[PDB]
Amino acid sequence: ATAAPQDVPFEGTLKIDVDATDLQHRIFKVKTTMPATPGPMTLLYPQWIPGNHSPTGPIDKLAGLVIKVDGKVVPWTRDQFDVYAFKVDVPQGASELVAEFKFLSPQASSQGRVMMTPEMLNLQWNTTALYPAGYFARNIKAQASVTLPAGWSYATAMETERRVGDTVTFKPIDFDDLVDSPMFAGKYYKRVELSAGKQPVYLNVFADEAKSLDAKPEQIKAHAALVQQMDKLYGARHFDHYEFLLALTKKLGGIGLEHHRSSENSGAPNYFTEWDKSWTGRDLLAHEFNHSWNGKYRRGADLATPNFNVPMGDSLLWLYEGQTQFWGEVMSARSGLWTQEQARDMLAGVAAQYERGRPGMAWRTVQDTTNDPTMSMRRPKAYRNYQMSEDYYSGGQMMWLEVDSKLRALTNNKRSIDDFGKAFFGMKNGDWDVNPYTFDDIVSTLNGVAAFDWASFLRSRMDGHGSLIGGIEANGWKLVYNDEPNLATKTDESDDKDASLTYSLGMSLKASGDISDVLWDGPAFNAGLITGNTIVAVNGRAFSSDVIKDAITAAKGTTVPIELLVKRLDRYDTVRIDYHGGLLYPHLERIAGKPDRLSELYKAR
Amino acid sequence: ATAAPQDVPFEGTLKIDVDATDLQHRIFKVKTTMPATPGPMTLLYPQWIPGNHSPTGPIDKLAGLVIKVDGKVVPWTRDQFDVYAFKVDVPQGASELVAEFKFLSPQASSQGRVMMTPEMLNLQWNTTALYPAGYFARNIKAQASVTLPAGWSYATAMETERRVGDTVTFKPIDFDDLVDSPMFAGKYYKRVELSAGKQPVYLNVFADEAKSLDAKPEQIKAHAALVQQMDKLYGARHFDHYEFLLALTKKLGGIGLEHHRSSENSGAPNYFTEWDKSWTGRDLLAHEFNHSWNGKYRRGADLATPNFNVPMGDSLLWLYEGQTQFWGEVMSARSGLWTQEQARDMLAGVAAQYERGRPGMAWRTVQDTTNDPTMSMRRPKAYRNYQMSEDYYSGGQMMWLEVDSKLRALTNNKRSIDDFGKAFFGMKNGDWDVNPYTFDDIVSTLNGVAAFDWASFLRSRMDGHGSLIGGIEANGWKLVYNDEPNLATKTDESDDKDASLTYSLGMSLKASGDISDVLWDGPAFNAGLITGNTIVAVNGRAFSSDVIKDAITAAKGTTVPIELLVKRLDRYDTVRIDYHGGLLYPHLERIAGKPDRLSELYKAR
Numbered sequence A, B: 001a002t003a004a005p006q007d008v009p010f011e012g013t014l015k016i017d018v019d020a021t022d023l024q025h026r027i028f029k030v031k032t033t034m035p036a037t038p039g040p041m042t043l044l045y046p047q048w049i050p051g052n053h054s055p056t057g058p059i060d061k062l063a064g065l066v067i068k069v070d071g072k073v074v075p076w077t078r079d080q081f082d083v084y085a086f087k088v089d090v091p092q093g094a095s096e097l098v099a100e101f102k103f104l105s106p107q108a109s110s111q112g113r114v115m116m117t118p119e120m121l122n123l124q125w126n127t128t129a130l131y132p133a134g135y136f137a138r139n140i141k142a143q144a145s146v147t148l149p150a151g152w153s154y155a156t157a158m159e160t161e162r163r164v165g166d167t168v169t170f171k172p173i174d175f176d177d178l179v180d181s182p183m184f185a186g187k188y189y190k191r192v193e194l195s196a197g198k199q200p201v202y203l204n205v206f207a208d209e210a211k212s213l214d215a216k217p218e219q220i221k222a223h224a225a226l227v228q229q230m231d232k233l234y235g236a237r238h239f240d241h242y243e244f245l246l247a248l249t250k251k252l253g254g255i256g257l258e259h260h261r262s263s264e265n266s267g268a269p270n271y272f273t274e275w276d277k278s279w280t281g282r283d284l285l286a287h288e289f290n291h292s293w294n295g296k297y298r299r300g301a302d303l304a305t306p307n308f309n310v311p312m313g314d315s316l317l318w319l320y321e322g323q324t325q326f327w328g329e330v331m332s333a334r335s336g337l338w339t340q341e342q343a344r345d346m347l348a349g350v351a352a353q354y355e356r357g358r359p360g361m362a363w364r365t366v367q368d369t370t371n372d373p374t375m376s377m378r379r380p381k382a383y384r385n386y387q388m389s390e391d392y393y394s395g396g397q398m399m400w401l402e403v404d405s406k407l408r409a410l411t412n413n414k415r416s417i418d419d420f421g422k423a424f425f426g427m428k429n430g431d432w433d434v435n436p437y438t439f440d441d442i443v444s445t446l447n448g449v450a451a452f453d454w455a456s457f458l459r460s461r462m463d464g465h466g467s468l469i470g471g472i473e474a475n476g477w478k479l480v481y482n483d484e485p486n487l488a489t490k491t492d493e494s495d496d497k498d499a500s501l502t503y504s505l506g507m508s509l510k511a512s513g514d515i516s517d518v519l520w521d522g523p524a525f526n527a528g529l530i531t532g533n534t535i536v537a538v539n540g541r542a543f544s545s546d547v548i549k550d551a552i553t554a555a556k557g558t559t560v561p562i563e564l565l566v567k568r569l570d571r572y573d574t575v576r577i578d579y580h581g582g583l584l585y586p587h588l589e590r591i592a593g594k595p596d597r598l599s600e601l602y603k604a605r
């Protein structure tokens, strides 16, 4: 029941002062100061957070709220039909409103992602802000300040005015850009320049331990090459400068959140020190960097809302996140963050996920999964393979691969998806405002690269139940399965000694034997198994990942079923699974007669 | 973005057929059938569920949705601004629409409360229903049927039409009453008569094991006495019959959900077999039963919404839940479910919670906590004592105790809160349609019992930051603290060897030493401790509940701080706590000069 935002001028400055020193309790103390308008005033806590596409504003972690007008406490009343809105009565003749409160950041992952550690912290200004209703967020001039733990370094795209002791005062900035300008801070910090020039790019690394900061020259070069490969694709940079924020940690909550001139990224402490073991997650920075073009600068019209407290429309997330998921993996290969073999096996895993690992495609479309952020909030679901889960990411990626293959086929390889990126995102270098688009704009730009009924193509994939993996075969490769482990799966289930058996027994297991996932309508599903049941023994032998894998191989081509001793709650039973296909892991193999367009796409420019 | 529901007739019957046989996967298979009106049609999945006061409808657990009109599949489109709304186009000349889908109930507590076990199940019809938009829910005639696991018994307030094998068909009923008529089913079942007559009351017990059903005659009498004591209070029953549903289980998710003619209740398997050990939870059935009057029959006007897909206004929950919490404990004493000593120590614990255990009262009011269902959804919060948490329950209980004492003082003990209950809820015996009320109705009825400015009294308590425990002293008792354990705390910490130290060290601990709660501004809080930290040792000795309690006693009156070895994540440190007050547990003591009105209130009528 809050009035709609108005594109009207905001008089004065919204001052946000944050004390970020209580690392033990994980509390941010906040004071927000703003001109006071006589009459009923409504203050808003940001609800829909850009980049999350859902109402992730942690309203229940705002505590200790006290509001004073010219030094006098005024009682506040929350709108019971808009719990993010706080109403007060401002007397006639008033000058200034001051709101003080605390943001109680998660004390465990069960409360949300952790944002403070003994060595670092992550400040997202939307969690420490109240702003007046009735204004477009871009119309509110803001000025932020933060008091850091003693001696800590910090990094943010937002420009600093001065640091006095441990209190950093920033230059004035529009309120929407303030929310889009998060801060990392910590005691173990290394700043590396990735690109010089007029629009420079920097890498800011914070770590649990200083040893994680020892990035080698070739490792830094791959990150510098990422910026170079991005320039080749778009031909423009949508920022006056860019600040990568990377936390190498086991304590901070994982994050991959994009912004115009920065991104919040988390990685394992061995991101650099064990480069060959930590590769599966190294597409993160390429992914978030691409969003500066696709998502931040160019955004769906129904997603580009006027403030943080009106609902966002996620209908075009299969471009926002879908093509960014596509380019994140592509750019990883082009920059050297991934090897070509690593990128190709990653692609095989995605292709298998939609050919055999998503039986829920029979009833649900990828378009409907753009509602998953608001529907699920990434909360646990029983069957990610049947309920589906934000498949506008990887399912959208597969479509954009087919778009690339179709663009090549229509033009005899003279045009590709690279031409769409430059045409759709490469305009107005230096602009980091919002440039909205609609579905028709995507179709029109695609048609400008190569004439075709792109409207039908896009809708048939996003609104259909059929195959999404056509881009693999069109670009000269074929998805196959054999007993050779997938490079991603091998790395992602080793050390833990887990067992991914999605395409054989239709389940995944931990080393303990606990089932961690069950494929809908697969062999494990048809034995009544669910996640949380335990495989106790295989053919009478105590469970291990190697034991169940060897039994799958021993059952290949025979008629002797696999005998599984299963614990369901407090009961034990034995099931016989008649699976005789052996171990099956996805790979890509060349089609000899066809041109290898896939390697062209993944090749450095 | 869904059109508002209108109080217009709905032509035909909404048929809801549920297959509840897949206990292994915990899946409810659903077929919903209704007349199909040509043109655009929107189907709604219930979102706001009565009794939860929040949008708890599990939309992301609806899977496999296929909609057919006269046997022909029609594509559905979800409203991206209303994810509970499914839109289809019904062709001209059509007759019938059928929607088939599956409700994937929780496979572990992390997905929600478990609703299916090998021995029992809980069917909530809102999870297995789709209904047409544009109609008041009470205008939709519905008919439900369910196929049970072979041979299982069932219980529900809904009248049965026929059971053919294991398929139970219920008589037609208004759709809003269908959602309000849940079913328990199981293999170990006992039906116990609590009250005969024209408006009979029955207790339906389902258990993990048949041995738990051996309720003794004196135990049944206490439940029968509960019905008699409620008759004395209200003088009317708002149902044609009432069916308690009680699950004695360690497998089904806990539940306490009220309805007009039934309630969903869970207890431990030793609810009857270890009567003396399971007492702390025995106010549940009294609590839920009272809601048939206070909450179901009488409801705040802003809470009595026209369908399940418009937001609810929780502003008057301090009567709905607050006075029900009050009567739940009082009726436990009056009926014999609790002894008078147990009820008195329970009340002492509530009084201490608001005298010393709720420092968040300094900034937040009890009225604002009526927004907690939608703000928090009972998700984990760091400081329930400072953020506060649904204090319209126990904080509301204390206000109603003060209301009772004021009614007695105004009338020389000739009137009490019993007269409000009869006046406000005792009209129209047999009626179980909703009779809404506003704040002014509460004031007017209180004024009719005894003239007073009740509007100011209620607002000052619920919009204030002052003491809520004034009814204790006004009714002749005083809240005190000593080292004698509270009966509730002792029972709720024994066997597990846990340690509740809220009023000494300001924290609670598990037997492992893991801190489970920290009181804002208390001694543990002032040492930087948070929930999830571990107390490893006390004065150098490995932690136990007895060890830390003995150290608290040993520190009483001295100046030697308590040395606690603490594990915080992967670091160990020793903290010195300068607490010298000893162990402190709350109790109620008589005021010798004042009349004992409290014992009158808790005495059986």
Ligand code: NA
Residues within 6 Å of the ligand: A138, A174, A177, A432, A433
């Ligand atoms: Na801007």
Ligand code: NA
Residues within 6 Å of the ligand: B138, B174, B176, B177, B432, B433
């Ligand atoms: Na009714």
Ligand SMILES: [Zn+2]
Residues within 6 Å of the ligand: A258, A287, A288, A291, A321, A324
């Ligand atoms: Zn992304």
Ligand SMILES: [Zn+2]
Residues within 6 Å of the ligand: B258, B287, B288, B291, B321, B324
């Ligand atoms: Zn209740």
